Symmetry: C3
Subunit: 350 residues, 3 copies
């Protein structure tokens, strides 16, 4: 009944994960929406959610890593987008999809960055011209200009229903967006149609396969859930990435201590005095630093169950952390001022 | 055919749009589920939501203008209720119905102010006594007083089940809440029945016509994904009016500049410093001055994609704005102190 | 019949509510799906939500009172758990179950503190080992330590599938987690099963009867309407217990007065200057003093519609309040220093 249970070995997380999830989904599709328990082969210690969280961080890291070539980063927008060229990776997309779902069912928030269109497509919708704004700003401006051109296309701008599709070392791939997209020039009359097709390409046709497998994954989990009724894509984004809540009161509550600290410690009582006087940008930095993100789960920061463990006597070492357990490793410094200097330099340098 | 597309001309908005949306119902009524694209006739410009937003603003403005007689404004609650008298308007209601629908699939929040009962009736519920508290303060007090009277009603009040519905000229038309209200005095025992019948008429019967229309319209652009998963009337009010989130950081992000401003600029930085140090009260006056409201869209303020453009050298002119584009025309003043002075006076003067 | 309507006399709330609800349940049970209208006998006075609120406070208070012995309190977590030995109380559990349900539709929050496991069980999900962590902190640690032990369970912890269950005055109750738990020693191979079964019994089998009644009561008010499909139980908790918003601006708007105090009054304006400064730790206390909790309903503090009534001329008493209506009886002090000094002592003394 309850209990999902995934046993995967680091080194093969993705393969192992996938394989198990495909069987479970085959046996009881519902088991995919239950309380997740991850276990790394050969490593003991009950998963209180921290393991499952590391499981998520790890999968997310491999997938968006350029190495595997599944997504492309936009230095500009700071968002990934499927790489149309990803080949023989149906399984990984199926997995990153499953994981996004599992992440929604366990109050776990991933640090993923897709353009609104990825969620919009996950809502069964087609990417359109307006959607081009976030995914491909550059391209969108051109189509915008072309659209808003006052002169006479054709004789001015000589373009057809053919478009380029390069690969790493150039080599465009003159794709026809329409039957004979060679001799059908773009006119102040085609442009409208040209743009909507150029847009349907890029956002949809261009990336099916990769995206088809991606949704299949998200759907093995989100099938039959309040997701079918969500309105805007931001709602799915909130479910996956978290809100921008900022309690800290509540975060202070539910904050446990290990290594001999306890709620009453000059170092702890000082920590909070400091943290609360923090500016929000600083509070969000601390969060990134101690957790995988700067956002909050469903219920707020208090649901993060942070742990401030001692990490040596006074020193100069910067406080470190384990973002999968939300554990702040804090060396018991001699002064509030030192704690403050050392904490700020630690989270701003991250 | 991406987009819904509404080609309408100012100086004939409500009609035209009603005529298109209607016809869009006479054919593949699916389109209503798509992404709205408004186009004012004559005017050339790609709708990136700014034209659409204006469509909404202008519409909402007329529909609630006393002139068109569809709604009445409660000077005190600053809310609007349906007008039992507006007949021959059973299409203009079906219109805001659509507009409210559309506004939910667009993260464009409206400037609609309905007493909770409207949303309650939309979720499919009957209006009751308690609802009068906001929709009819004064009426509610009278009925609350009737029920709470400690003396002997009948031996103290000359009222029966025949209540009046009065003109705009002082002419009353008797209306019987029950079989033969003329006789049949209200007693300490009927008063409840009386209050319940007087409330049912006024919140349900008296405006069945205009509401049903409003319901249909809302129903035309959202069907199937009802307010299922929305348990409180308040949840629907947010979808249409935004939350009271006030992120600002994030609003600072996503903010673009124009006319030579850029993220770096003494003025632009003095602005943020100022805006950030703004009391929440002020912060709300500014969203209202720059956007059509003090509320926030799904996803926080950052989704406003606000724009701040330079508007000539240090003047005395107070800044200005095009709410439908979230653009803040800011004169390149000669000082951070002058910016704050002119800005505040401008946001408080609107 | 607009409302549910529970006419009950104090001194007999649990009993009267139960009888009336048992009648409403028999006759058109529909009433169970209408907004609650409470009437304390012999106390004429429209229930504007105030009465309902008091009714909840009294019911929750009585039901979670150590006297009736239905729930047990954990002083570490400050949470309540079902008492497995709460024998002839099947009707009370239903009542408190019916309350939580109404809470879901009332923008009035119940200050009920349950381990997240309760709300998962309400969604028809069985509790799990991880779930204990909150309901049974110490038992959990044991089982965890049991599972993490690197030694040799048997010749180290000598234990079996027979656990010990006590009653008010010691005297365990050797419950067999398995067939003849007597002679099946827990080993490094059993413990997983031992721990599952132990976690199962406790959260599920152990409270079966009492929780079944509880769930039923909840179910009576929340039929079909998903709540069963929500992604996270915390979503059910929020609806019932409120979030942690702290608008105050907004709480200042919507705030009404009585007994002379008009929106404008040096004493009134002096009030907002004090509160608006304050610390959001004091602001949490103040909120706890005037209303039940420091949490806000759907929408924010503004929804609380707090009332500031003048409680006689300048005295030396501490301002007082009726939490059921979020009413702060404020004596018209001789300055804000009095005001500010009196209030601060009140909220930190009540």
């Amino acid at each position: 009944n309850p209990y999902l249970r995934l046993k995967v070995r680091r080194d093969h997380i993705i393969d192992d994960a996938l394989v198990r999830l495909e069987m479970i989904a085959m046996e009881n599709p519902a088991d995919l929406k239950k309380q997740l328990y991850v276990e790394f082969e050969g490593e003991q210690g009950v998963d209180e959610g921290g393991v499952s969280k590391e499981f998520f961080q790890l999968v997310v890291e491999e997938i968006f890593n350029p190495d595997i070539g599944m997504f492309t980063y936009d230095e500009s927008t700071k968002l990934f987008w499927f790489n149309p060229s990803s080949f023989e990776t149906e399984g990984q997309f199926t997995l990153i999809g499953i994981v996004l779902g599992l992440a929604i069912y366990n109050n776990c928030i991933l640090d993923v960055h897709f353009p609104m269109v990825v969620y919009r497509k996950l809502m069964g919708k087609k990417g359109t011209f307006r959607d081009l704004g976030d995914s491909h700003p550059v391209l969108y401006q051109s189509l915008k200009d072309l659209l808003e051109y006052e002169g006479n296309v054709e004789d001015d701008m000589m373009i057809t229903f053919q478009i380029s599709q390069t690969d790493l070392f150039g080599n465009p791939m003159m794709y026809d967006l329409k039957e004979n997209g060679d001799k059908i020039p773009i006119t102040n009359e085609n442009r409208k149609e040209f743009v909507n097709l150029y847009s349907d390409y890029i956002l949809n046709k261009s990336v099916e396969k990769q995206f088809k497998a991606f949704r299949r994954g998200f759907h093995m989990v989100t099938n039959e859930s309040p997701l079918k009724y969500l309105f805007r894509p931001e709602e799915i984004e909130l479910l996956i990435c978290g809100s921008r809540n900022l309690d800290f009161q509540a975060l202070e509550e539910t904050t446990e201590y290990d290594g001999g600290y306890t709620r009453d410690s000059v170092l702890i009582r000082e920590f909070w005095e400091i943290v609360h006087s923090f500016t929000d940008e600083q509070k969000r930095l601390f969060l990134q630093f101690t957790t995988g993100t700067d956002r909050a789960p469903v219920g707020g920061l208090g649901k993060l169950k942070m742990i401030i463990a001692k990490n040596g006597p006074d020193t100069e070492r910067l406080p470190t952390s384990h973002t999968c357990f939300n554990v702040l490793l804090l060396p018991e410094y001699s002064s509030k001022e030192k704690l403050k200097e050392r904490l700020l330099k630690a989270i701003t340098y991250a």
